[PDB]
Amino acid sequence: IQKTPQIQVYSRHPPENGKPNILNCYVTQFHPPHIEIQMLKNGKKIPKVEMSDMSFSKDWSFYILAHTEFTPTETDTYACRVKHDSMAEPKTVYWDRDM
Amino acid sequence: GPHSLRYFVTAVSRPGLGEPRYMEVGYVDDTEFVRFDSDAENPRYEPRARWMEQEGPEYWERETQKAKGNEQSFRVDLRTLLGYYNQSKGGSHTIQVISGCEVGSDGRLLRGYQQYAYDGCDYIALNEDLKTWTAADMAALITKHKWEQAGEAERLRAYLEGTCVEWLRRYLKNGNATLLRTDSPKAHVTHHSRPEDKVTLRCWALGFYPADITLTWQLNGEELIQDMELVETRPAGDGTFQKWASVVVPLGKEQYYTCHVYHQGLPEPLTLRWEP
Amino acid sequence: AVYNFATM
DSSP states (O other): OOBOOEEEEEESSOOOTTSOEEEEEEEEEEBSSOOEEEEEETTEEOTTOEEEEEEEOTTOOEEEEEEEEEOOOSSOOEEEEEEOTTOSSOEEEEOOTTO | OOEEEEEEEEEEOOTTSSSOEEEEEEEETTEEEEEEETTSSSOOOEEOSGGGGGSOHHHHHHHHHHHHHHHHHHHHHHHHHHHHTTOOTTSOOEEEEEEEEEEOTTSOEEEEEEEEEETTEEEEEEOTTSSOEEESSHHHHHHHHHHHHHTHHHHHHHIIIIIIHHHHHHHHHHTHHHHTOOBOOEEEEEEEEOSSSEEEEEEEEEEEBSSOOEEEEEETTEEOTTTOEEOOOEEOSSSOEEEEEEEEEETTOGGGEEEEEEOTTOSSOEEEOOOO | OOOOOOOO
16 A cells, blocks of 8 residues: 655744754655655755654555754745655655745 | 543564664643654653653653554564465555543543554454454454464553553643643634635634634534534644634624633633634 | 563
8 A cells, every 4th residue: 555745844933044943854644655855945955854753654654754844944944855655756845834 | 531542653674674663752732741762863661741850760661662662562562464365575564553541520430442554444442341352354363363362452441540540640730730731712803805805704713722722613603513614633843733724704793703711721702703 | 660561
């Protein structure tokens, strides 16, 4: 069986330019467990990314959090790019500050 | 209220690429507190919550040795199940286990559990009696029979009633400032235009602990559960959680819809609307 | 805290 990841990108606090925050990429509801999750700043991989909160749901699908400390600036764009066998191409979800 | 100790364990084969990846992730309630990952540079059990600094070197040594033994057991299991199911050595397979216990506010056992899956499907589980197994297929029936002959349920029950509850009590004591805290949600509503003279209203709840929460939208006193989009409550990187729920409403009529937030840290539930 | 799991 094969389940496509749901990818959600969000900050811990409502974003304010110049104020430290945390960016999150929660990747959920997927199977099989092999996966690549990269967080990107202006199209470039962010180096210090912490992986945490790995769990499974009742239907055994995998859940995991990538997160990183960050200080937003008005020009910076952030994204999460995920490669999984369920998807022909890597899927990228962009942080939408106004969501 | 009640509390839980849960281990999420995963073994994943990688034919052609060496030994399986093996991980154990431990939670007290909704908080990650320990982890073992076979792919780390130096694989050992590690603290994932600050209060686990209160355990000495002997704790980390024992848990590490136990994890390494478990890793070897799961390696064997992956090969065993290939035989049970008549599968080739060339494909990746996954074993998953959820193992743990829940206690009441008085520290006494409410429930124990141990559930296994293979390739994302139910395999075998301990029943709520803590004495018998349910097997989902004929492969798992082989495992059930081995475990019956070896007295495995009694060994497992002794863990669940003994070790599991006793360590859970200790973790709750040591981690009380983190685990028994309440962080109140802070909420806000955002507004987005749509085609067709309609409007998305999104109610956000931020910064809360524990994870259990309810967000609803109301029109004229009635909940709109069928028309709502939402996300599953989700961790926000610092031990708190967040959630949103949205509804689509007619332009000009946003004032009539209210978001309601119910949580442990809200003596009275929040009621809010869009603020132009 | 973690159980010592049995082989399957």
